[PDB]
Design an enzyme around this catalytic site. Structure first.
Site, PDB file in Angstrom:
ATOM      1  CG  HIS B 226      21.762 -17.458  -3.379  1.00  0.00           C
ATOM      2  ND1 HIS B 226      21.069 -17.612  -4.364  1.00  0.00           N
ATOM      3  CD2 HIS B 226      21.211 -18.100  -2.174  1.00  0.00           C
ATOM      4  CE1 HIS B 226      20.284 -18.660  -4.136  1.00  0.00           C
ATOM      5  NE2 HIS B 226      20.529 -19.095  -3.080  1.00  0.00           N
ATOM      6  NE  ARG B 269      22.776 -19.727   0.904  1.00  0.00           N
ATOM      7  CZ  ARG B 269      22.023 -19.004   2.013  1.00  0.00           C
ATOM      8  NH1 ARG B 269      22.408 -17.962   2.718  1.00  0.00           N
ATOM      9  NH2 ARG B 269      20.869 -19.547   2.777  1.00  0.00           N
ATOM     10  CE  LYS B 272      22.679 -22.543   3.114  1.00  0.00           C
ATOM     11  NZ  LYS B 272      21.745 -23.662   2.892  1.00  0.00           N
ATOM     12  CG  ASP B 275      18.697 -26.738  -5.268  1.00  0.00           C
ATOM     13  OD1 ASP B 275      18.188 -26.830  -6.356  1.00  0.00           O
ATOM     14  OD2 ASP B 275      18.010 -26.546  -4.410  1.00  0.00           O
ATOM     15  CB  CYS B 277      16.498 -24.817  -9.022  1.00  0.00           C
ATOM     16  SG  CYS B 277      17.152 -24.217  -7.398  1.00  0.00           S
ATOM     17  CE1 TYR B 278      20.808 -23.629  -4.954  1.00  0.00           C
ATOM     18  CE2 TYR B 278      19.876 -21.917  -6.169  1.00  0.00           C
ATOM     19  CZ  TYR B 278      20.220 -22.384  -4.962  1.00  0.00           C
ATOM     20  OH  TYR B 278      19.533 -21.942  -3.942  1.00  0.00           O
ATOM     21  CG  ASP B 330      16.751 -29.895  -3.784  1.00  0.00           C
ATOM     22  OD1 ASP B 330      18.292 -30.281  -3.944  1.00  0.00           O
ATOM     23  OD2 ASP B 330      16.799 -29.006  -2.874  1.00  0.00           O
ATOM     24  CG  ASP B 337       9.539 -28.761  -7.089  1.00  0.00           C
ATOM     25  OD1 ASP B 337      10.106 -28.203  -8.053  1.00  0.00           O
ATOM     26  OD2 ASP B 337      10.006 -29.080  -6.195  1.00  0.00           O
ATOM     27  CG  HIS B 340      13.547 -28.719  -8.186  1.00  0.00           C
ATOM     28  ND1 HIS B 340      12.572 -28.236  -7.181  1.00  0.00           N
ATOM     29  CD2 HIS B 340      14.858 -28.244  -7.478  1.00  0.00           C
ATOM     30  CE1 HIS B 340      13.134 -27.816  -6.076  1.00  0.00           C
ATOM     31  NE2 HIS B 340      14.558 -27.884  -6.491  1.00  0.00           N
TER      32      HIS B 340
HETATM   33  C1  736 Z   1       6.428 -25.153  -3.545  1.00  0.00           C
HETATM   34  S1  736 Z   1       7.593 -25.589  -4.786  1.00  0.00           S
HETATM   35  O1  736 Z   1       8.823 -26.547  -4.336  1.00  0.00           O
HETATM   36  O2  736 Z   1       7.027 -25.729  -6.023  1.00  0.00           O
HETATM   37  N1  736 Z   1       8.610 -24.370  -4.762  1.00  0.00           N
HETATM   38  C2  736 Z   1       9.636 -23.802  -3.678  1.00  0.00           C
HETATM   39  C3  736 Z   1       9.635 -22.194  -3.636  1.00  0.00           C
HETATM   40  C4  736 Z   1      10.016 -21.646  -4.966  1.00  0.00           C
HETATM   41  C5  736 Z   1       9.852 -20.090  -4.880  1.00  0.00           C
HETATM   42  C6  736 Z   1      10.639 -19.473  -3.633  1.00  0.00           C
HETATM   43  C7  736 Z   1       9.658 -18.944  -2.689  1.00  0.00           C
HETATM   44  C8  736 Z   1      10.268 -18.448  -1.465  1.00  0.00           C
HETATM   45  C9  736 Z   1      11.660 -18.308  -1.320  1.00  0.00           C
HETATM   46 CL1  736 Z   1      12.464 -17.909   0.209  1.00  0.00          CL
HETATM   47  C10 736 Z   1      12.594 -19.132  -2.316  1.00  0.00           C
HETATM   48  C11 736 Z   1      12.192 -19.563  -3.469  1.00  0.00           C
HETATM   49  C12 736 Z   1      13.065 -20.342  -4.330  1.00  0.00           C
HETATM   50  N2  736 Z   1      14.416 -20.824  -4.075  1.00  0.00           N
HETATM   51  C13 736 Z   1      15.098 -21.402  -4.724  1.00  0.00           C
HETATM   52  C14 736 Z   1      16.305 -21.888  -3.953  1.00  0.00           C
HETATM   53  N3  736 Z   1      15.828 -23.059  -3.253  1.00  0.00           N
HETATM   54  C15 736 Z   1      14.802 -22.769  -2.274  1.00  0.00           C
HETATM   55  C16 736 Z   1      13.599 -22.316  -3.126  1.00  0.00           C
HETATM   56  C17 736 Z   1      12.863 -20.102  -5.907  1.00  0.00           C
HETATM   57  C18 736 Z   1      11.861 -19.634  -6.502  1.00  0.00           C
HETATM   58  C19 736 Z   1      12.250 -18.986  -7.869  1.00  0.00           C
HETATM   59  C20 736 Z   1      11.103 -18.073  -8.474  1.00  0.00           C
HETATM   60  C21 736 Z   1       9.979 -18.331  -8.223  1.00  0.00           C
HETATM   61  N4  736 Z   1       9.536 -18.910  -6.665  1.00  0.00           N
HETATM   62  C22 736 Z   1      10.421 -19.630  -6.237  1.00  0.00           C
HETATM   63  C23 736 Z   1       9.314 -22.244  -6.186  1.00  0.00           C
HETATM   64  C24 736 Z   1       9.203 -23.763  -6.202  1.00  0.00           C
HETATM   65  C1  FPP Z   2      13.765 -14.183 -11.439  1.00  0.00           C
HETATM   66  C2  FPP Z   2      13.693 -14.714 -10.202  1.00  0.00           C
HETATM   67  C3  FPP Z   2      12.528 -14.629  -9.031  1.00  0.00           C
HETATM   68  C4  FPP Z   2      14.929 -15.528  -9.741  1.00  0.00           C
HETATM   69  C5  FPP Z   2      14.939 -16.540  -8.617  1.00  0.00           C
HETATM   70  C6  FPP Z   2      16.320 -16.364  -7.988  1.00  0.00           C
HETATM   71  C7  FPP Z   2      16.242 -17.332  -6.764  1.00  0.00           C
HETATM   72  C8  FPP Z   2      16.409 -18.772  -6.821  1.00  0.00           C
HETATM   73  C9  FPP Z   2      15.967 -16.850  -5.501  1.00  0.00           C
HETATM   74  C10 FPP Z   2      16.872 -17.302  -4.233  1.00  0.00           C
HETATM   75  C11 FPP Z   2      16.190 -17.053  -3.027  1.00  0.00           C
HETATM   76  C12 FPP Z   2      16.781 -17.367  -1.556  1.00  0.00           C
HETATM   77  C13 FPP Z   2      16.612 -16.448  -0.667  1.00  0.00           C
HETATM   78  C14 FPP Z   2      17.700 -18.354  -1.518  1.00  0.00           C
HETATM   79  C15 FPP Z   2      17.887 -19.092  -0.209  1.00  0.00           C
HETATM   80  O1  FPP Z   2      17.131 -20.130  -0.126  1.00  0.00           O
HETATM   81  P1  FPP Z   2      17.631 -21.458   0.474  1.00  0.00           P
HETATM   82  O2  FPP Z   2      18.689 -20.916   1.834  1.00  0.00           O
HETATM   83  O3  FPP Z   2      16.697 -22.427   1.159  1.00  0.00           O
HETATM   84  O4  FPP Z   2      18.614 -22.305  -0.550  1.00  0.00           O
HETATM   85  P2  FPP Z   2      19.986 -22.363  -0.491  1.00  0.00           P
HETATM   86  O5  FPP Z   2      20.765 -23.221   0.667  1.00  0.00           O
HETATM   87  O6  FPP Z   2      20.695 -23.178  -1.682  1.00  0.00           O
HETATM   88  O7  FPP Z   2      20.813 -20.999  -0.582  1.00  0.00           O
HETATM   89 ZN    ZN Z   3      16.022 -25.882  -5.610  1.00  0.00          ZN
END
Ligand code: 736
Ligand code: FPP
Ligand code: ZN
Lengths: 313, 401
Positions: B226, B269, B272, B275, B277-278, B330, B337, B340
């Protein structure tokens, strides 16, 4: 006896009798607040009391019930979960009931690290994994790709060592969506730890299977990444029929994946002193250029890096 | 514009007349994205890719002071809001008032634990994610005031209270384990210069077991590759000077496949969705692999571009990941937010700035005012912030024993 935050007769803790003995503790964001959150007043309320209880480390039954609301307002507050799980220990709460709880919470919001790590803990304490594969399957049934569900699922399988029926579950899901890359991963996980891909009987099955799945959905990148994944460790050059096999697909089952898998084959043959090292290369450089100019341009930099590498060996 | 170009239609999904939940949802996304591209070819005007700077600014302007109760879910991730916002301004080249700075600092002092590290907010237990966030924040402010906020000696003490026998780290006491911790640890320990000889002993090896049959890295050994974890993985190694513990070639082939041939942006991934942030988690790996490979005198590397279609990524971001009112997002249809906003920008920057020794080649799509300050592809803060912080903390000695 819980009074639901959603109950129409819900009363803020500052208006409750069983909580008058305690002064709530307002959060301290300092004099010049930054990224300050203007909380609702139900939320401010619950936490001002959580701070109080946490402050004096009050390990009581009401504190326990308070963590529930604190959690429901922000399931991602890891301090609350920590403290809650401290009360499970002190108050010696029936942990099988805690399972029922964390089960409800996960169902309603499955993409939260705390919730799963909390379940994991209960499971470890109880040393009971009897209801995990079923629970996980229900989650994965709502989201066949929940990353936490799978990670938690592997953990369970490998700890309690419950392999016997997982590859069967994998075939189930691939059949429901051959493109679920989480399942192909799961498939490789199951095999890598059970039989491995050395037993020719198995490598055969898989490769035969994968080619079949490829034939059905030519443009399914997972099948391909898997096909290359199970053969890349020994070298695609040691399977002389493979190349052929694929080239037959050029017309009837073409995709830029086929084109790229071929480059991988050619790549590995020069690496293993094949014969027609002159011939094979141009053929490989041709494809890399095609991929770069036409078939797969989004990554011309990559496919142009490839000619350029194979240009020096 | 690469994305609006005719033949680009051809890079549209081919389900092979065999639809699954996957192909369906992918089809939907492309469908909406297309409508975005075709919005210009709509009997009107010339496509003007413009970064709505003024608007992202005002957005970030208040966010730094207050948030609606809509952010009660991030009540345990305030150090991030600081970082995310206070970094987006950085990329926009906006200034950080010497007053707000002291505030951020004082606030973070409240989030910091008397046991090392930082919590998600005043009085919360220390957690590496918040710790990571807090530290970059402080370094972005780069003032000796900010630096002094960090308690180097107990921060290290914290890192050990979490380090595991197999090399991994817990995110916090009694918390979970995955590569995010390795990165957060290596990110703070290195900047603050507290890396003892045995702090990360065995971590490079653990990280390495996260790389799977896909070429990418998973959260933990055995899991699907991922983008988010792949960054934390590689970045962590680059810090530990161990890129080579990984099969860099399969990794490269993996990350590159992660960019969507149609949308232009990346997916976290295989199979999938796209997005925003990626654009930093996935695309960010390229600047990193360029170093690794190059440090091995790789002769095929490029003198100007990263190994992904930098243009397509900027078009995806500019045209598809940006909200009129302000802030990035996204994909279209999704809400804005600070997360992103922080990463679509960081991503944008990476795709428009190329480095490699003497080499410097920027690629700015649309109006030239769309150029953002550069970001260090490991810590994702200013190259200069990194440099400044590092040199400053090396004046100090690692918590000797
Ligand atoms: C409430 S918000 O919108 O500000 N917020 C959504 C949640 C984000 C948060 C998060 C929390 C739980 C899980 Cl399981 C994944 C993720 C995530 N993921 C990255 C991949 N896509 C799903 C989110 C990225 C991420 C990376 C660094 C810090 N926090 C998060 C921070 C921003
Ligand atoms: C330094 C630091 C904390 C880095 C953050 C790394 C990061 C983005 C974490 C991934 C979290 C995760 C389990 C993805 C699945 O979310 P999803 O299945 O909803 O999204 P997806 O479909 O794109 O995989
Ligand atoms: Zn995202």
């Amino acid at each position: 006896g819980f009074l639901s935050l959603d109950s129409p007769t819900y009363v803020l803790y500052r208006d409750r009798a069983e909580w008058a003995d305690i002064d709530p503790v307002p959060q301290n964001d300092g004099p010049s607040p930054v990224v300050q959150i203007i909380y609702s007043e139900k939320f401010r309320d619950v936490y001002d009391y959580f701070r109080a209880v946490l402050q004096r480390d009050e390990r009581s039954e009401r504190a326990f019930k308070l963590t529930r609301d604190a959690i429901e307002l922000n399931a991602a507050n890891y301090t609350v979960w920590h403290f809650r799980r401290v009360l499970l220990r002190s108050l010696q709460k029936d942990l099988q009931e805690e399972m029922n709880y964390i089960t409800a919470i996960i169902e309603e919001q499955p993409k939260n690290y705390q919730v799963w790590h909390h379940r994991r803990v209960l499971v470890e304490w109880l040393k009971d994994p009897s209801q995990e594969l079923e629970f996980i399957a229900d989650i994965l049934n709502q989201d066949a790709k929940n990353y936490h569900a799978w990670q938690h699922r592997q953990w369970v399988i490998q700890e309690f060592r419950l392999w016997d029926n997982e590859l069967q579950y994998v075939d189930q899901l691939l059949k429901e969506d051959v493109r679920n890359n989480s399942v192909w991963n799961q498939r490789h996980f199951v095999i890598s730890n059970t039989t491995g891909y050395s037993d020719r009987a198995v490598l055969e099955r898989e490769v035969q299977y994968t080619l079949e799945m490829i034939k059905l959905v030519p443009h399914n990148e997972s099948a391909w990444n898997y096909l290359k994944g199970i053969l890349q460790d020994r070298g695609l050059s040691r399977y002389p029929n493979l190349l052929n096999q694929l080239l037959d697909l050029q017309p009837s089952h073409s995709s830029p994946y086929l084109i790229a898998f071929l480059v991988d084959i050619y790549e590995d043959m020069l690496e293993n002193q094949c014969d027609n090292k002159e011939d094979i290369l141009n053929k490989a450089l041709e494809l890399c250029e095609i991929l770069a100019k036409e078939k797969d341009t989004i990554r011309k930099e990559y496919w142009r890096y490839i000619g350029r590498s194979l240009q020096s060996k | 514009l690469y994305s609006l170009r005719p033949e680009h239609a051809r890079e549209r999904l081919q389900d092979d007349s065999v639809e699954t939940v996957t192909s369906i949802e992918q089809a939907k996304v492309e469908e909406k994205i297309q409508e975005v591209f075709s919005s210009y070819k709509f009997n009107h005007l010339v496509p003007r890719l413009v970064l709505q700077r003024e608007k992202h600014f005002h957005y970030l302007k208040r966010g730094l002071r207050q948030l609606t109760d809509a952010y009660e879910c991030l009540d345990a991730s305030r150090p991030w809001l600081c970082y995310w916002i206070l970094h987006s301004l950085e990329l926009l080249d906006e200034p950080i008032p010497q007053i707000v700075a002291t505030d951020v600092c004082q606030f973070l002092e409240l989030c910091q634990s008397p046991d090392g590290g930082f919590g998600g907010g005043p009085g919360q237990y220390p957690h590496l994610a918040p710790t990571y966030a807090a530290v970059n924040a402080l370094c972005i402010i780069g003032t000796e005031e900010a630096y002094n906020v960090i308690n180097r000696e107990k921060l290290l003490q914290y890192l050990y209270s979490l380090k595991q026998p197999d090399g991994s780290f817990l995110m916090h006491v009694g918390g979970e384990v995955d590569v995010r911790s390795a990165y957060c640890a290596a990110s703070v320990a290195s900047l603050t210069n507290i890396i003892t000889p045995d702090l990360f002993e065995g971590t490079a090896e653990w990280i390495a077991r996260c790389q799977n049959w896909e070429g990418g890295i998973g959260g933990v050994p055995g899991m699907e590759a991922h983008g988010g974890y792949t960054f934390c993985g590689l970045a962590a190694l680059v810090i530990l000077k161990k890129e080579r513990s990984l099969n860099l070639k399969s990794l490269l082939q993996w990350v590159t496949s992660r960019q969507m041939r149609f949308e232009g942006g990346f997916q976290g991934r295989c199979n999938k969705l796209v997005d925003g942030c990626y654009s930093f988690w996935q695309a960010g790996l390229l600047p990193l692999l360029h170093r690794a490979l190059h440090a091995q005198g790789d002769p095929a590397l490029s003198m100007s571009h990263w190994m992904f279609h930098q243009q397509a990524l900027q078009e995806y971001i500019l045209m598809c990941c940006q909200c009129p009112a302000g802030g990035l997002l996204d994909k279209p249809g999704k809400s804005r937010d600070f997360y992103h906003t922080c990463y679509c920008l960081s991503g944008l920057s990476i795709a428009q700035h190329f480095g490699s020794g003497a080499m410097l080649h920027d690629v700015v799509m649309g109006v030239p005012e769309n150029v953002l300050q550069p970001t260090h592809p490991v810590y994702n803060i200013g190259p200069d912030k990194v440099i400044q912080a590092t040199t400053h903390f090396l004046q100090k000695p690692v918590p000797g024993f």
